[PDB]
Scaffold this active site. Sequence first.
Site, short mmCIF file in Angstrom:
data_model
loop_
_atom_site.label_atom_id
_atom_site.label_comp_id
_atom_site.label_asym_id
_atom_site.label_seq_id
_atom_site.Cartn_x
_atom_site.Cartn_y
_atom_site.Cartn_z
N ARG A 68 0.90 -1.08 -0.04
CA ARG A 68 -0.18 -0.19 -0.03
C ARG A 68 0.90 1.37 -0.12
NH1 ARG A 68 -5.45 -1.33 3.48
NH2 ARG A 68 -5.54 -3.64 2.93
N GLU B 164 0.95 4.30 1.12
CA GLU B 164 0.46 4.98 2.21
C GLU B 164 0.78 6.40 2.16
OE1 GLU B 164 -1.84 4.15 4.66
OE2 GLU B 164 -1.74 2.14 4.10
N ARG C 94 2.38 3.24 13.01
CA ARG C 94 1.75 1.96 12.83
C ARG C 94 1.26 1.49 11.33
NH1 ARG C 94 -4.84 2.44 13.30
NH2 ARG C 94 -4.75 3.39 15.36
N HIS C 95 1.89 2.06 10.13
CA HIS C 95 1.61 1.62 8.84
C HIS C 95 3.10 1.62 8.21
CE1 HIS C 95 -2.19 3.83 9.58
NE2 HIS C 95 -2.59 3.21 8.49
N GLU D 189 -6.00 -0.90 15.65
CA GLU D 189 -6.76 -1.78 14.84
C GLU D 189 -5.59 -2.89 14.45
OE1 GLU D 189 -8.32 -0.17 11.54
OE2 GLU D 189 -8.12 -2.05 10.49
N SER E 21 -9.38 -6.04 10.28
CA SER E 21 -10.90 -5.76 10.07
C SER E 21 -11.67 -6.81 9.13
CB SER E 21 -10.92 -4.50 8.79
OG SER E 21 -10.95 -3.46 9.52
N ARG F 125 0.89 -5.70 12.63
CA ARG F 125 -0.01 -4.99 13.88
C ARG F 125 -0.23 -5.88 14.72
NH1 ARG F 125 -3.68 -1.15 11.59
NH2 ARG F 125 -2.17 0.33 10.31
N1 LIG Z 1 -0.17 0.11 5.77
C1 LIG Z 1 -0.36 -0.94 6.60
N2 LIG Z 1 0.74 -1.50 7.45
C2 LIG Z 1 0.44 -2.48 8.07
N3 LIG Z 1 -0.62 -3.19 8.34
C3 LIG Z 1 -1.73 -2.84 7.61
C4 LIG Z 1 -1.64 -1.54 6.62
N4 LIG Z 1 -3.06 -1.24 6.26
C5 LIG Z 1 -3.64 -2.31 6.63
N5 LIG Z 1 -2.89 -2.99 7.48
C6 LIG Z 1 -3.32 -4.12 8.29
O1 LIG Z 1 -4.22 -4.96 7.26
C7 LIG Z 1 -5.66 -4.96 8.20
C8 LIG Z 1 -6.81 -4.89 7.10
O2 LIG Z 1 -6.73 -3.87 6.09
P1 LIG Z 1 -7.58 -2.63 5.98
O3 LIG Z 1 -7.72 -2.24 4.70
O4 LIG Z 1 -8.57 -3.07 6.90
O5 LIG Z 1 -6.87 -1.53 6.89
P2 LIG Z 1 -7.45 -0.01 7.45
O6 LIG Z 1 -8.44 0.05 7.78
O7 LIG Z 1 -6.86 0.77 5.99
O8 LIG Z 1 -6.15 0.23 8.36
P3 LIG Z 1 -5.64 1.59 9.26
O9 LIG Z 1 -7.07 2.25 9.75
O10 LIG Z 1 -4.84 1.27 10.38
O11 LIG Z 1 -5.14 2.42 8.24
C9 LIG Z 1 -5.54 -3.83 9.23
O12 LIG Z 1 -6.28 -4.22 10.16
C10 LIG Z 1 -3.99 -3.77 9.46
O13 LIG Z 1 -4.04 -4.82 10.39
MN LIG Z 2 -9.77 -1.57 8.85
MN LIG Z 3 -9.06 1.32 9.65
MN LIG Z 4 -5.59 2.54 6.23
#
Ligand SMILES: Nc1ncnc2c1ncn2[C@@H]1O[C@H](COP(=O)(O)OP(=O)(O)OP(=O)(O)O)[C@@H](O)[C@H]1O
Ligand SMILES: [Mn+2]
Ligand SMILES: [Mn+2]
Ligand SMILES: [Mn+2]
Lengths: 438, 438
Positions: free
Chosen positions: B214, B216, B222-223, B361, B364, B412
């Site tokens: 991703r 970001e 946390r990412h 989180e 999800s 995470r």
């Molecule tokens: N950039 C990232 N780095 C690490 N883990 C990630 C990342 N984005 C998502 N995840 C993990 O994948 C899971 C499912 O992805 P999802 O798309 O639901 O994340 P997200 O809601 O965008 O996460 P967040 O709100 O922390 O940005 C998240 O709960 C998290 O544990």
């Molecule tokens: Mn999520």
């Molecule tokens: Mn989220």
């Molecule tokens: Mn996200």
Amino acid sequence: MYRTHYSSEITEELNGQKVKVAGWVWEVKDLGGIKFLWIRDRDGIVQITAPKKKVDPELFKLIPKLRSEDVVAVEGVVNFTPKAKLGFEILPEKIVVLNRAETPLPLDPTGKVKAELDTRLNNRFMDLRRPEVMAIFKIRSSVFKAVRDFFHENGFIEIHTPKIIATATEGGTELFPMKYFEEDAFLAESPQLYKEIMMASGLDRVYEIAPIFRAEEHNTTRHLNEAWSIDSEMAFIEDEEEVMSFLERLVAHAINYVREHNAKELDILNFELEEPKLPFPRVSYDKALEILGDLGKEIPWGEDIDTEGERLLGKYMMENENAPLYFLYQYPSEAKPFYIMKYDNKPEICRAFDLEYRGVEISSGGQREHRHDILVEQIKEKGLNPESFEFYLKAFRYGMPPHGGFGLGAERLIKQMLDLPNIREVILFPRDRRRLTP
Amino acid sequence: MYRTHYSSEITEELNGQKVKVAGWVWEVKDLGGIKFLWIRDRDGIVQITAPKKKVDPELFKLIPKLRSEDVVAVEGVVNFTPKAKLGFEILPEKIVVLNRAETPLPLDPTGKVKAELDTRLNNRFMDLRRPEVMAIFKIRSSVFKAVRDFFHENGFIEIHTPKIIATATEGGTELFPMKYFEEDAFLAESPQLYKEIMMASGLDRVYEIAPIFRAEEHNTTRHLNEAWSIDSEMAFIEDEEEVMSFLERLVAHAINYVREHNAKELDILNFELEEPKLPFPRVSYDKALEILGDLGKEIPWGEDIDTEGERLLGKYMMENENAPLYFLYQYPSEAKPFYIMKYDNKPEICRAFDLEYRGVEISSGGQREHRHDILVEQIKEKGLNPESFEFYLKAFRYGMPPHGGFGLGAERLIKQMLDLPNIREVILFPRDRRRLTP
Ligand SMILES: Nc1ncnc2c1ncn2[C@@H]1O[C@H](COP(=O)(O)OP(=O)(O)OP(=O)(O)O)[C@@H](O)[C@H]1O
Ligand SMILES: [Mn+2]
Ligand SMILES: [Mn+2]
Ligand SMILES: [Mn+2]
Ligand SMILES: Nc1ncnc2c1ncn2[C@@H]1O[C@H](COP(=O)(O)OP(=O)(O)OP(=O)(O)O)[C@@H](O)[C@H]1O
Ligand SMILES: [Mn+2]
Ligand SMILES: [Mn+2]
Ligand SMILES: [Mn+2]
């Protein structure tokens, strides 16, 4: 959950008890005073028997309305009887249609009308409804598990290395370039440099099972542009035979696990998977070239053995040693990577090996050159710039134990194990020269 | 091999027996009538005791020449004695120097001189020589194994899906575009579409542990731009609570595996990892907004709970129920993906949930919308084009059971489990807005 048991989990102990089964409608036979419904799940078919005098009239009229591939859930009483082909039937008390299938179906789940590979790949969800395809993927999952269990039992720690990278590589070919914000990067083709770097960490015994991405020039029944590689690197070895010994035991473990745990699947595939015989034969490169020469196949000493050569050797080893698996080793140093350690006593050959399964390479490995200065010279001998590998070379300067490892292709292992003609049969959504979807 | 036993594998049982230990030179005491050498391996330190009267003269003279971080192997006799702080010492017969370390070292393995995170990430092979860092990676490997074991014990089959995708574009930004020969493609952010397609195959219960990518927009603690996601999807469920129940059991299993098998690492980390208490609290989005409002934190209904909202809720859940883990569920449908099923009786709310660990989180998931026509309308409601999803939508037309699943971030999970301030501490080679190499 709409089911309590899969077709395979109903045993005599449940005779007379209420259970819930669920799956796809396989067949419906309305034979007047009695009707039958067969439901298919991942493990097989379950028979639902509806004698008119023993079921709810609404259920009796519902059955003939069910259609092939409709998803249904049934709650009923288990009845073991000789009259039931599989040993037991379910007397239904309730039948719920969860989701109806459209028609015509993309592929024929009965197997009567054959479909070309491309159509099957475009409709994998239908393809796996056929037992012989589900068998391959069940076996794929068992192979991954057996491999990881063997690593764990042998003191290996699982690691994870980057797939987005921006560092040098020996060949500079088959790369998938990608922009990384303002920087240029590429998808990794192997964790080679990283697992070696970690040999300087104390981890000592590592493995990684992860994707590798290679933009192969053209299609073959043995390559994919996205594949899963089983990589390992181990320190404090005395020679590459210790690595080969480990690899063959790992491969034998995976084969034996499939033989033990997936007999049902091998039977569906009408395939007899051989009991491994360790140690596998070792054939030196010199001997391989002599054998090929006598077969009319010319490989100039110094060049790698091509795919035709491997095919010929595989056949030769099956005919002469009854060996589906064997190692090619003591390759010319000029034919293998700069990171392979040469035989100090005979520099023209090196400590690399390839493990061949049914005439196709499934793994490559060897003892690495852990002595910094020698490694640097080897980079120069390959006509490359040592400075471009600085992040990697630095790891050899502060206490680097001797080490060796291998890269074992998961698809290669499974395809060869099941003697399948095409690698596309062992990965759900292949990526090749022209296939990018689904 | 140069070693037979790691420092942790030597017990009373072996007193008086010969073994081979190997590792990095940790300390040397050069005295007139005796030399002591301590070496470090991945599990700890081993004392080598060499009285002049007892060892070979060449070995006695060799020890003083050893330097910090040199790699050596030692064959000797195990001798238990209260005079050795660790309980035993090895009386050496032979010592071999496998590789010498340069000085100065990139990082200080003794831990006396601290280094910033960036410097440690640049020299990861040095960083893991410190027990507190090695501890994290041993625990990471343990968590992966526990998760897979739990999936297997519960009937899940491992699958592997593409990381190179044509599009799916179930979103807009945060994607890494990449060229696939002549085509435009992207790196996958989630196996979502594929694991759903497989719910129409009969596999029913699948999991995949693989990289996700991703791009970001913002750099946070946390990412990462590359991570490992633990994905699962399961069929024939009646509601999202069945998925949450499975997920909490999976996470509890991982936590308990670490408590049971990595007690030594938890101690090195001076961390007390709590025993999971199931079931975890379930807090609806409405209730979370009420708790937050009661605290003065206002979140307009329909908007996601922000980072501070999550922090406050996590703190509240510890205070109120001693719950480091809890679910947020019944989110507004506008706040979640088109593939989530809405409550048919209250459409503004949907069957999606988030698992929070120490106020962050970690996962999800939700029950998906398996009814084709409704799914197409939701794709439209999200401003997307159903025609961009033909391979995916096709799987919902030929018998698709209800299903649900989740994406659980491996980094995470580990970061939160160990209450670590930065996610970069739990992956060997992090990828973020400013870090692309090593
Ligand atoms: N950039 C990232 N780095 C690490 N883990 C990630 C990342 N984005 C998502 N995840 C993990 O994948 C899971 C499912 O992805 P999802 O798309 O639901 O994340 P997200 O809601 O965008 O996460 P967040 O709100 O922390 O940005 C998240 O709960 C998290 O544990
Ligand atoms: Mn999520
Ligand atoms: Mn989220
Ligand atoms: Mn996200
Ligand atoms: N394109 C590919 N598709 C599938 N598996 C592959 C591919 N390339 C390599 N592998 C697997 O990874 C292993 C180690 O990689 P290595 O770079 O040594 O392969 P290679 O020598 O390039 O393979 P080949 O000669 O078959 O192209 C190979 O033995 C094979 O099992
Ligand atoms: Mn190749
Ligand atoms: Mn090859
Ligand atoms: Mn090879």
